[PDB]
Design a protein around this nucleic acid. Structure first.
Ligand code: MG
Ligand code: MG
Ligand code: MG
Ligand code: MG
Ligand code: MG
Ligand code: MG
Ligand code: MG
Ligand code: MG
Ligand code: MG
Ligand code: MG
Ligand code: MG
Ligand code: MG
Ligand code: MG
Ligand code: MG
Ligand code: MG
Ligand code: MG
Ligand code: MG
Ligand code: MG
Ligand code: MG
Ligand code: MG
Ligand code: MG
Ligand code: MG
Ligand code: MG
Ligand code: MG
Ligand code: MG
Ligand code: MG
Ligand code: MG
Ligand code: MG
Ligand code: MG
Ligand code: MG
Ligand code: MG
Ligand code: MG
Ligand code: MG
Ligand code: MG
Ligand code: ZN
Lengths: 37, 126, 60, 176, 136, 192
RNA sequence: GCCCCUAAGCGUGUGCUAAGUGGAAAAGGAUGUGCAGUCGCGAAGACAACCAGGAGGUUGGCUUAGAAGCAGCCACCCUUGAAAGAGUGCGUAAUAGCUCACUGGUCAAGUGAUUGUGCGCCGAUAAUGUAGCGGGGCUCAAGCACACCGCCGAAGCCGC
RNA sequence: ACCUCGAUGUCGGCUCGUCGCAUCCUGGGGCUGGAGCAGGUCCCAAGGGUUGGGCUGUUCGCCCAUUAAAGCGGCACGCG
């Protein structure tokens, strides 16, 4: 969980979604999953 | 590709079909590029082997009475033109299909009528 | 405002209609009447609605 | 929305009853009920199709149209045929077995693990290494699948734990 | 580390920073440039870091133009000193930038890494800025 | 080299001044002035969106037709102002030009090609002044370099030009410069 | 200022807001949402998905113990052609494999990108007790944007 | 230098606590260059606890021996 205000689609496959007003990026690559907070 | 590209592809197929004696459409599905190249080299003495968009060939088919084969393009379709005689490429395709087990002959065109796979086999035997 | 809302009209509309009708009676006498004669308010609200224009949101 | 434009086919051996906003499905495998969102309406086409309609082109209608269509399609297809999810228990000293309606897992813990089976779900064991679950509701089937899967923490080194049929976990090793 | 060789007077009042930049509003030395948006004090160390960033990414080809020069000085007294008793010594030289002024200019073939390097420079400046091309 | 005119509609200004001009700008219309050798300057309003679209389509310099209460005018976009921040249009100068006249035109130039490993690309001059006919104005100029080595200074006068165009700029102007590729030592030495 | 504490519109017409934003704040980040202006492709079938193809010179040279499309450096050439990119990567010492790029089959119209915009979300963590709308409460705005009609409102003005 | 010079008593120690969380442990999670233990880092979390001594007036700090830790700060540098 790399918690940082700026989140980007690091690889070509990381995907950004929206949850409870917090947008977080999810990828099958484990570290590519983070939240912005 | 562009609209001009589609138009020139249709045109090129038109002169190719007009200058060819007969045509056959087969299924390239499940055929490795290696054996496809081998088949092309084997049939390159007389015939030619290419592929094209089903809808593009459908539009190109309105010029002649080959409109009856439009129902046969449902599924992968590879079109071959027999510039020299008729039976050589048909027999080559038949033996390739029976050897590889993954190629299916959809049908062929000859004498102005659309004929089924059994008739393809019969004329290739002839 | 209490009396106007009892008679089914707002204070601002009642005052504007009263001014349009040109009645110069003051809030002292209106309040004493509200304590006193609902007949007087019935007549007054009738006059106010009669003097009220057709559309309140006209650009005029 | 785009899928919602496509009506849901209804098989012959399925009975559907609708009363206002509540909807129910009658079939050989059982009965199920759901309630749909207020702003949108659903209708029964006379040719054996499910028609769902949204009143406007706004956000809520656009979203809920496809939700309703796919939920009804899943409901009717599960009620007619059904749903099976099978698991594989890979590892050493890992034992699974079924008694009655309950399930017992020997997952290496010092104490045995027992899970109570909810209503409307069935379990069947084929091998002590892999079993399957059968049911009618995708909700309950997925709930059980997740509950079973969360017994064991992820193991990216040795593959210890539980997983589905096609689930793949990446392999990684340490030199030390 | 852009510092003027010599200045006639070594201390200057607080500069005015009002209005919209008139000079150097359009980019013409190369093809691509960066235009600022807000009022700011841009320092020589910031210019050095931005130029290092631009070259550090553009590598072999291309070259850089800089349309500003940090020659305005600023003073600062050291801490633990009562205020007054004269002016402090000048510490860093700054270049006052007005909105819309062109900061850096680039001339490299391809849009991809051209915009990439310009953004690399953008991320090191303290104020908002945008890419601008030679075409109006 | 032949071009086609661009059609647009325009209206004459009602009020003149900073307030009226800024009100029109807030509305979404750009004020413009039409003056020329006809000894009859005019001030008009244009559509910002259509003007920007035409500018994007036909570059900085295009030949334009003006519709003033149904009247047809032939004019050239010669000078203009652009906002430093909003990158919008605030003023443009339109010069009436008839067919068969000599005008001074500034045109942008582009450079393309493949460079050798020891070649550094440099472009000092990007706009040159060319005298040509109104309907023969080119939109862009291209130059090609292939296998350039050492000193290969490209001269503006050396650029090939179409027929009917005159080079107002002196031949001493240089447009493209090719020198040896830089080194880390020189890069770290410069600026210190 | 006009929902109540408190006097006046739980006023009218047209739009935005889901955050109690309104009712503390930045760099920066995001398939939040509304408007306007574009271009590419799209009934000659787009975009996504779901079967197949994705090799022969070819292990391209230097470098290395090692370099085979995937430490690194140079053309980044070429053939069957539908398309092979000196390969975007997660793969092995190095091979070999999983792939992918462009392309071909079914379905059947929107699919992308920057552009200027009004609101928004995160970025947000201090000490006695809410404590950053005055409070209750307010989106079934009592918030914001634009017009219209009115009212309350001082010792200001007018009347005696 | 805005309140206090017709008076706001000052550092440390003893007793006595209180509050915030930027958390020392205990509690729950994400990732690893986390074979296992043993780790590193980030998030949520203030319920509870948070050594005794030698030295110096000390605060601080060094050293001696454990425990889960021997928290950071605010409260007129808490409190005559
Ligand atoms: Mg000047
Ligand atoms: Mg900045
Ligand atoms: Mg009060
Ligand atoms: Mg009241
Ligand atoms: Mg209302
Ligand atoms: Mg109002
Ligand atoms: Mg409205
Ligand atoms: Mg919030
Ligand atoms: Mg606020
Ligand atoms: Mg903000
Ligand atoms: Mg940004
Ligand atoms: Mg492929
Ligand atoms: Mg080669
Ligand atoms: Mg290499
Ligand atoms: Mg936009
Ligand atoms: Mg309030
Ligand atoms: Mg009044
Ligand atoms: Mg008074
Ligand atoms: Mg007076
Ligand atoms: Mg003082
Ligand atoms: Mg005082
Ligand atoms: Mg005293
Ligand atoms: Mg005291
Ligand atoms: Mg003291
Ligand atoms: Mg915390
Ligand atoms: Mg823990
Ligand atoms: Mg860690
Ligand atoms: Mg805590
Ligand atoms: Mg407690
Ligand atoms: Mg002691
Ligand atoms: Mg305290
Ligand atoms: Mg004290
Ligand atoms: Mg204390
Ligand atoms: Mg204290
Ligand atoms: Zn990823």
């Amino acid at each position: 969980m790399k918690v940082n205000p700026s989140v980007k689609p690091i690889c070509d496959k990381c995907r950004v979604i929206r949850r409870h007003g917090r947008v977080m990026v999810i990828c099958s690559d484990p570290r590519h999953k983070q939240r912005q907070g | 590709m562009a609209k001009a590209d589609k138009a020139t592809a249709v045109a090129d197929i038109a002169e190719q079909f007009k200058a060819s004696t007969a045509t056959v459409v087969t299924e390239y599905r499940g055929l490795t590029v290696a054996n496809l190249a081998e088949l092309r080299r084997a049939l390159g003495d007389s015939a030619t082997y290419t592929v094209a968009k089903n809808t593009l060939v459908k539009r190109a088919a309105s010029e002649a009475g080959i409109e009856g084969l439009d129902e046969l393009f449902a599924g992968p379709t590879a079109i071959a033109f027999v510039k020299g005689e008729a039976v050589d490429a048909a027999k080559a395709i038949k033996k390739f299909a029976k050897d590889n087990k993954a190629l299916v002959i959809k049908g062929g065109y000859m004498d102005g009528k659309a004929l089924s796979v059994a008739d393809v086999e019969k004329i290739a035997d002839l | 405002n209490a009396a106007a809302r009892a008679n089914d009209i707002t204070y601002n509309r009642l005052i504007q209609g009263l001014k349009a009708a040109g009645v110069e009676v003051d809030r002292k006498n209106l309040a004493e009447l509200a304590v006193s004669d609902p007949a007087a308010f019935t007549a007054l609200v009738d006059v106010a609605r009669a003097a009220l224009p057709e559309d309140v949101n006209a650009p005029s | 929305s785009r899928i919602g434009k496509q009506p849901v086919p209804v098989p012959s051996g399925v009975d559907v009853t609708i009363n206002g906003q509540n909807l129910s499905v009658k079939g050989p495998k059982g009965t199920l009920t759901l309630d749909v969102a207020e702003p949108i309406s659903v209708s029964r086409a006379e040719d054996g199709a499910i028609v769902v309609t949204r009143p406007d082109d706004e956000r809520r209608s656009r979203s809920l149209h496809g939700l309703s269509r796919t939920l009804i399609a899943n409901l009717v297809t599960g009620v007619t045929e059904g749903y099976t999810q099978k698991m594989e228990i890979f590892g050493v000293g890992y034992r699974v077995q079924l008694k009655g309606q309950n399930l017992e897992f020997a997952l290496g813990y010092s104490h045995p693990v027992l899970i109570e089976a909810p209503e409307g779900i069935t379990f069947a064991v084929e091998s002590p290494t892999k079993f399957s679950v059968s049911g009618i509701d995708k909700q309950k089937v997925g709930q059980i699948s997740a509950v079973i899967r969360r017994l064991r923490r992820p193991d990216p080194y040795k593959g210890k734990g539980v997983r589905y049929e096609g689930e793949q976990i990446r392999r990684k090793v340490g030199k030390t | 580390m852009l510092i003027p060789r010599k200045v006639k007077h070594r201390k200057q009042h607080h500069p005015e920073q009002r209005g919209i930049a008139s000079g150097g509003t359009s980019v013409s030395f190369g093809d691509y440039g960066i235009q600022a948006l807000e009022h700011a004090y841009i320092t020589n160390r910031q210019i050095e870091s931005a130029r290092i960033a631009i070259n550090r990414h553009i590598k072999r080809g291309g070259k850089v133009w800089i349309n500003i020069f940090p020659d305005r000085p600023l003073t600062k007294k050291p801490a633990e000193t009562r205020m007054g008793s004269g002016k402090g010594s000048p510490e860093w030289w700054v270049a006052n930038v007005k909105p819309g002024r062109v900061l850096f200019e680039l001339s490299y073939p391809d849009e991809k890494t051209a915009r990439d390097a310009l953004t690399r420079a953008i991320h090191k400046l303290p104020i908002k800025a945008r890419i601008v091309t030679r075409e109006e | 080299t032949a071009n086609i005119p661009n059609k647009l509609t325009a209206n004459v200004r009602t009020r003149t001044g900073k307030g009226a001009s800024r009100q029109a700008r807030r509305d979404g219309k750009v004020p413009a002035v039409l003056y020329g050798h006809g000894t009859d300057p005019q001030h008009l309003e244009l559509n910002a969106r259509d003007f920007a679209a035409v500018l994007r389509s036909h570059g900085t310099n295009a030949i334009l037709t003006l519709d003033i209460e149904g009247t047809e005018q032939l004019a050239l976009t010669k000078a203009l102002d652009v906002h430093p921040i909003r990158r919008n249009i605030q003023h443009a100068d339109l010069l009436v030009v008839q067919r068969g006249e000599k005008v001074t035109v500034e045109v942008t130039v582009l450079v393309e090609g493949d460079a050798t490993p020891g070649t550094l690309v440099t472009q000092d001059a990007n706009t040159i002044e060319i005298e040509a006919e109104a309907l023969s104005i080119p939109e862009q100029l291209t130059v090609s370099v292939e296998g350039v080595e050492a000193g290969t200074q490209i001269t503006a006068g050396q650029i090939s030009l179409p027929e009917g165009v005159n080079l107002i700029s002196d031949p001493e102007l240089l447009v493209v410069n090719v020198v040896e590729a830089p080194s880390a030592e020189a890069l770290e030495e410069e600026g210190a």
